Amino acid sequence: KTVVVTTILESPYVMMKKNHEMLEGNERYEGYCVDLAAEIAKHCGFKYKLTIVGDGKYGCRDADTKIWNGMVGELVYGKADIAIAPLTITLVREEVIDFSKPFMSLGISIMIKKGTPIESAEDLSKQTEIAYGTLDCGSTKEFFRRSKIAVFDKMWTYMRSAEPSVFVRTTAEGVARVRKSKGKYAYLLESTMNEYIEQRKPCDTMKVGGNLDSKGYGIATPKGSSLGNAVNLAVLKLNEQGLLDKLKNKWWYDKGEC
Amino acid sequence: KTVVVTTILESPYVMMKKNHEMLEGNERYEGYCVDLAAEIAKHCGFKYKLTIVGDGKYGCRDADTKIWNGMVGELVYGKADIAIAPLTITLVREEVIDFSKPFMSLGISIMIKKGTPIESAEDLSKQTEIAYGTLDCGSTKEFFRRSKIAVFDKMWTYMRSAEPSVFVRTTAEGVARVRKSKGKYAYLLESTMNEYIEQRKPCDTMKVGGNLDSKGYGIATPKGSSLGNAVNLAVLKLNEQGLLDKLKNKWWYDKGEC
Ligand SMILES: N[C@@H](Cn1cc(I)c(=O)[nH]c1=O)C(=O)O
Numbered sequence: 001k002t003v004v005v006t007t008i009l010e011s012p013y014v015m016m017k018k019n020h021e022m023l024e025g026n027e028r029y030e031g032y033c034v035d036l037a038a039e040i041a042k043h044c045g046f047k048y049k050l051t052i053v054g055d056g057k058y059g060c061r062d063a064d065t066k067i068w069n070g071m072v073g074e075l076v077y078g079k080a081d082i083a084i085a086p087l088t089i090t091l092v093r094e095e096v097i098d099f100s101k102p103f104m105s106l107g108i109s110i111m112i113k114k115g116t117p118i119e120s121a122e123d124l125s126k127q128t129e130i131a132y133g134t135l136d137c138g139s140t141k142e143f144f145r146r147s148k149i150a151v152f153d154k155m156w157t158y159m160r161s162a163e164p165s166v167f168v169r170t171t172a173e174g175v176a177r178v179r180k181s182k183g184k185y186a187y188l189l190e191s192t193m194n195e196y197i198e199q200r201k202p203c204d205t206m207k208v209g210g211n212l213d214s215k216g217y218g219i220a221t222p223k224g225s226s227l228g229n230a231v232n233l234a235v236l237k238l239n240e241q242g243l244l245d246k247l248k249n250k251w252w253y254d255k256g257e258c
Numbered sequence: 259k260t261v262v263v264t265t266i267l268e269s270p271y272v273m274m275k276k277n278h279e280m281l282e283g284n285e286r287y288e289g290y291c292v293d294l295a296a297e298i299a300k301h302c303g304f305k306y307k308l309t310i311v312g313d314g315k316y317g318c319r320d321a322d323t324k325i326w327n328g329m330v331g332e333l334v335y336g337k338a339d340i341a342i343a344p345l346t347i348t349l350v351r352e353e354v355i356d357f358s359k360p361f362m363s364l365g366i367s368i369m370i371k372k373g374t375p376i377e378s379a380e381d382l383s384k385q386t387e388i389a390y391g392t393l394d395c396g397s398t399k400e401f402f403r404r405s406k407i408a409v410f411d412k413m414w415t416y417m418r419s420a421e422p423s424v425f426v427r428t429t430a431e432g433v434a435r436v437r438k439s440k441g442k443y444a445y446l447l448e449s450t451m452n453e454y455i456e457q458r459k460p461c462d463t464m465k466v467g468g469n470l471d472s473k474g475y476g477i478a479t480p481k482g483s484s485l486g487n488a489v490n491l492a493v494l495k496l497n498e499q500g501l502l503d504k505l506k507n508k509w510w511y512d513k514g515e516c
Pocket residue numbers: 058059086087088089135137138139140141171188189190193
């Protein structure tokens with residue numbers, strides 16, 4: 001009956017409202033993905049419950065046990081009916097779960113503390129004074145681990161063995177590390193987040209260079225789910241009616257602080 | 259056994275080779291989608307025959323007869339097994355054919371003859387001296403026909419009723435009309451084509467403003483095709499390995515004339 005939605009606390013996709021503690025259920029949250037969830041449930045006509053992914057992760061497969069974690073795991077093992085989050089459509093995931101067509105297009109990008117002498121991935125790869133890393137257990141890390149491109153493989157070789165670890169558990173941790181690093185840590189992260197942070201106080205970071213790749217976020221369902229067809233059509237309808245563009249401007253720039 | 263591929267003569271996706279009269283079968287053609295077709299077939303392990311869509315159209319549904327034409331029609335009526343072309347993923351098409359995840363991301367954009375006093379769709383809609391139109395029988399025309407956004411519906415109201423027709427049969431016709439117009443015609447077209455033309459002699463056009471929307475091109479198969487699954491995985495794998503980025507570079511910029 002009630003669809004269980006798995007999602008992740010990631011601003012501005014899903015955030016606790018300022019007055020959350022006296023709110024209940026889905027009303028405790030706000031954001032792009034909260035709005036998107038409401039729109040999809042309205043067009044597909046279902047009731048739903050937003051639940052924050054227990055382990056706070058997007059999803060990766062343990063190399064030894066072969067068990068999936070994060071939001072991907074919640075679908076694979078039947079703990080959730082649908083994931084509505086900034087979840088990257090990838091080949092290894094497509095083999096275990098289903099994705100709608102993308103609701104957002106983006107790429108990997110570089111975040112620096114303002115004034116950092118870096119302008120590109122090539123710049124990062126050719127020096128050692130400035131540390132750099134990525135989010136753990138996500139598509140960005142896997143991009144570098146799997147890259148054959150000389151600069152990206154060179155970066156991976158450094159990142160894989162760097163001490164202390166250049167990888168972070170959450171996006172907020174990566175961003176804090178940039179801000180506190182005095183310009184000695186750069187962060188590789190998805191472009192739309194880089195762009196969001198750039199317009200938030202204290203306005204001390206910026207995106208440099210173009211995107212390293214191109215990819216999309218999709219709505220995910222368990223393989224063979226009776227929900228997947230309708231959800232995919234709903235995403236296309238929403239895009240075509242301009243709602244996705246409407247939501248982006250609402251959460252990204254109408255709230256810009258810089 | 260041999261998979262019939264429907265595609266469209268649209269530079270630089272599919273072009274006749276200079277000496278095509280001396281060649282046979284698939285070797286008559288070159289371009290982005292020719293290269294992509296060869297790679298999809300290699301990875302999925304099938305033999306294939308490239309065929310040019312008979313009516314030279316992408317695909318629209320006749321309002322009265324309800325019959326699909328163009329490449330979409332070839333798949334709907336079983337004349338082709340797969341379409342590998344700059345074919346836009348849309349809701350109405352997804353209702354009758356299947357698409358892979360996108361192999362290219364793009365949006366509707368404005369092409370001007372250099373010097374034309376236009377910077378945005380808002381600019382176009384608020385003036386009358388410069389005419390503007392789109393490709394007929396495609397996703398761009400349908401975007402304007404269906405839009406509830408004030409600026410775009412105003413543009414549609416003008417375009418639908420303009421005489422002579424501001425719509426064109428092929429991309430080349432639209433570009434030619436811009437070039438011959440002395441600034442008095444602007445062309446609305448997909449961004450990646452706008453970008454390609456900007457790098458073609460006589461280097462007298464340019465893209466202005468941001469994109470009007472966001473969408474993708476996908477490989478299409480008939481509903482229920484056994485090919486669908488494997489083709490989608492192939493597209494994801496090729497994106498992740500950088501092939502699609504390499505093919506754009508090859509056909510757009512390595513060959514740039516400006
Ligand atoms: N979208 C990713 C997770 N994710 C998120 C951000 I924001 C990032 O900078 N890198 C990531 O891998 C996924 O689905 O694994």
